[PDB]
From a paper:
Based on the structures obtained from our experiments, β[name] catalyzes the transfer of galactose from UDP-Gal to a broad spectrum of glycan acceptors with an SN2-like mechanism; however, in the absence of a glycan acceptor, UDP-Gal is slowly converted to UDP and two other products, one is galactose through an SN2-like mechanism with water as an acceptor and the other is an oxocarbenium-like product, presumably through an SN1-like mechanisms. While β[name] selectively binds to UDP-Gal as the donor substrate, it exhibits broader selectivity for acceptor substrates.
In total, we obtained eight structures, including β[name] in complex with UDP-Gal, Gb4 glycan, GlcNac-β1,3-Gal, GlcNAc-β1,3-GalNAc, and Man-β1,6-Man. All structures belong to the P1 21 1 space group, with each asymmetric unit containing two protein molecules.
Numbering used by the authors: 42 to 308
The structure:
């Protein structure tokens, strides 16, 4: 599948319950280390297996290439293919992770694609997934159902009429963090080449899901995904799945907070 790097893992021997696919660029070593020491730490969660992998492309920098090679050797949790790792190549990065699930971890019950600047409560997520009784063609996160392409020309998410010619986008979930049943990876990979390309990964995936007639669903009666970020509180963070706008130092402090208060009860 042209994977310069493959994780040292065997999903047939121990099928994971939840696989985390984390996007980060080569220089963001601090982010990856904070995740590996916090919510990305592999463990049983209510007896369910959690695995964490980092999606990376390639870089022109010889120094960064070397560092990432050493990191892969030392940690074995990097999935890599030869594509220029840049913001407007995030669609390739996403499709690489989905390809990895399809070819090497079709046993995964659930897969979460997430950003590096995020806080994820796998405990609460696992609890909600076990409660949802939705194991096939399932896809959730922060639902974006009536979106219009951004035509403001210097905007990060700007798309020309040539890049996306229609007035509205299909349903999709924030690329900050979305979750799906493992089977969906195979279906998306399968239809990927037939769907109109878009440089925005979450929209691209939304196009594929629409082609597949897979409808987006809310994970819970209450909001659990926060692309806009949140005011921090131990009690609030115990009852959410994902929060954006979290830098590495902050992530470590939040993880420590939750550890320090483990054992107290909340309203
Ligand atoms: C996305 O990554 C692809 C693959 O690396 C980039 O395409 C290559 O661009 C390099 C220059 O960096 C050329 O030398 C190659 O001929 C291209 N190869 C292919 C297969 O296209 C592409 O430029 C990247 N996208 C963006 C927006 O930077
Ligand atoms: C003010 O919030 C922003 O509002 C725009 C619409 O006006 C849009 O909903 C933004 O979400 C982004 O939408 C992009 C496609 O247009 C998508 O590729 C990005 O990943 C979205 N970003 C987030 C944070 O989900 C929204 O931020
Ligand atoms: O070349 C790049 C640029 C960004 N990212 C990742 O893509 C996600 C989105 O980037 P960022 O948070 O900077 O932007 P946002 O989409 O929250 O505006 C993050 O996990 C980044 O680490 C990446 O893997 N490669
Ligand atoms: C998930 O299922 C729980 C167990 O209910 C039993 O099993 C499911 C698969 C159905 O066949 C149901 O008719 C059975 O009684 C429920 O307690 C729980 O509410 C379900 N969760 C949701 C979100 O509906
Ligand atoms: Mn981000």
């Amino acid at each position: 599948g042209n994977f310069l790097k493959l994780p040292d893992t065997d999903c047939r021997q121990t099928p994971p319950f939840l696989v985390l696919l984390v996007t980060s660029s080569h220089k963001q070593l601090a982010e990856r280390m904070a995740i590996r020491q916090t919510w990305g730490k592999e463990r049983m969660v209510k007896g369910k297996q959690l695995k964490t992998f980092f999606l990376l492309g390639t870089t022109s920098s010889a120094a960064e290439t070397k560092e990432v090679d050493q990191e892969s050797q030392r940690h074995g949790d990097i999935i890599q293919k030869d594509f220029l790792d840049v913001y407007y190549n995030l669609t390739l990065k996403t499709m690489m992770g989905i390809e990895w699930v399809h070819r090497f971890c079709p046993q995964a019950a659930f897969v979460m694609k997430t950003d590096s600047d995020m806080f994820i409560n796998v405990d609460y997520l696992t609890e909600l997934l076990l409660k949802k009784n939705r194991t096939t063609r399932f896809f959730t996160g922060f639902l974006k159902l009536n979106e219009f392409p951004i035509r403001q020309p210097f905007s990060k998410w700007f798309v020309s009429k040539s890049e996306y010619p229609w007035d509205r986008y299909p349903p999709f979930c924030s690329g900050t963090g979305y979750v799906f049943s493992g089977d969906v990876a195979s279906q998306v990979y399968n239809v990927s080449k037939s769907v109109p390309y878009i440089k925005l990964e979450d929209v691209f995936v939304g196009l594929c899901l629409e082609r597949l007639n897979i409808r987006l669903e809310e994970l819970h009666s209450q909001p659990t995904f926060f692309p806009g970020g949140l005011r921090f509180s131990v009690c609030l963070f115990r009852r959410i799945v994902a929060c954006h706008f979290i830098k590495p130092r902050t992530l470590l402090d939040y993880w420590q907070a939750l550890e320090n208060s483990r054992g107290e009860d909340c309203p």
